[PDB]
């Protein structure tokens, strides 16, 4: 499922992540199907970074 994500690359120490969104969503999905856990996050490319 999508998260909002804003990347500022002027400083790679400046980032946006919606924290609260994640916890909320994790709990709802478990009631459809319990086999869903947080196993990671996708990055949309279009290449790898050091970041």
């Amino acid at each position: 499922f999508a998260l909002p994500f804003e990347e500022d690359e002027k400083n790679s120490d400046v980032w946006f992540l919606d924290h609260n969104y994640i916890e909320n969503m994790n709990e709802m999905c478990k009631k459809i199907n319990a086999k869903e856990k947080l196993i990671g996050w996708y990055h949309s490319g279009p290449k790898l970074r050091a970041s």
Binding site: D13, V14, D18, H19
Partner: protein, 197 residues
């Protein structure tokens, strides 16, 4: 007050543990973060506050905007007590947080406790100045750390951000004596303040 979205910034520098406020400044801050959250809600209950750290050696988003103090409390207790305040990163991070919200008809505020003098570049400070003026974000800084041996680089920029506007941006300076930190913030205007319009 009005319906307001605020990012509270907590400094976890190694001057955030000075003995100036009892018992230790770090224990003083636990009481102030709680106190401030509450003051804002009791004013008008349509207020929300998010939590990010500006220090730990890394900035971290703990909490997005919430009307529960239980999350803000939970983000606070997970901290690492040494850091260094990166003034620049906190302003940017705070600004992006303010673009996404559950209500997008709210005032845009950043309140930051500053417990150390800044080590930031001068050029960097000038860029954020006009970034705050583009997006119509007003900021009150509670300073009790950057007056201990430092002079305010920040003054000019905070002034500049003020326009006639229901929000007024202000530099708030606190005598760093013993009377406890929530008390000096209370006796400073921060919900006793008036507009610039």
């Amino acid at each position: 007050m009005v319906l307001e979205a605020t990012v509270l910034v907590i400094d976890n520098s190694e001057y955030s543990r000075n003995g100036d406020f009892p018992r230790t400044r770090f224990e003083a801050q636990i009481d102030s973060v709680e106190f401030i959250f509450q003051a804002k809600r009791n004013s008008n209950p349509e207020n929300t506050v998010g939590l990010i750290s500006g220090a730990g050696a890394n900035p971290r988003v703990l909490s997005t905007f919430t009307a529960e103090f239980g999350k803000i409390l939970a983000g606070l207790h997970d901290t690492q007590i040494e850091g260094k305040l990166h003034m620049a990163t906190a302003l940017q991070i705070a600004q992006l947080t303010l673009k996404h919200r559950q209500n997008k008809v709210q005032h845009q505020r950043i309140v930051a406790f500053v417990c150390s003098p800044i080590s930031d570049s001068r050029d960097e400070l000038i860029r954020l100045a006009k970034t705050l003026k583009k997006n119509n974000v007003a900021v009150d800084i509670i300073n009790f750390g950057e007056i201990e041996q430092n002079t305010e680089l920040l003054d000019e920029f905070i002034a500049a951000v003020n326009n006639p506007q229901e929000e007024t941006s202000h530099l708030l300076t606190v005598t760093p004596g013993p009377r406890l930190l929530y008390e000096n913030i209370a006796s400073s205007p921060i919900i006793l303040e008036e507009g610039s319009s």
